[PDB]
């Protein structure tokens, strides 16, 4: 039950089609160039290898560290 301003409020006229890529620059900035495969992999180690292996262990870092 939160509310925003009222629509005929909103003062974007001079917003031009240059300003917009403001937007595309923001969602890669926040998303990131590449993704989500060191994400998968990420959790993957954490939660599938021991909800897995189930079906306590777990993988240190390469090692001496390499």
Request: proline share 5%; glycine share 6%; hydrophobic share 40%.
């Given at each position: 039950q939160i509310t925003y301003g009222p629509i005929e409020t909103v003062d974007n006229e001079e917003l031009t089609e240059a300003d917009m890529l403001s937007f595309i620059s923001a969602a890669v900035n926040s998303?990131?160039?590449?993704g989500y495969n060191i994400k998968?992999?990420?959790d993957l180690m954490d939660n599938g290898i021991p909800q897995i292996v189930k079906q306590d262990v777990?993988?240190?870092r390469?090692?001496?560290n390499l």
């Amino acid at each position: 039950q939160i509310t925003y301003g009222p629509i005929e409020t909103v003062d974007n006229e001079e917003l031009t089609e240059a300003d917009m890529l403001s937007f595309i620059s923001a969602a890669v900035n926040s998303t990131g160039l590449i993704g989500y495969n060191i994400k998968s992999f990420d959790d993957l180690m954490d939660n599938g290898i021991p909800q897995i292996v189930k079906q306590d262990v777990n993988i240190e870092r390469p090692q001496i560290n390499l």
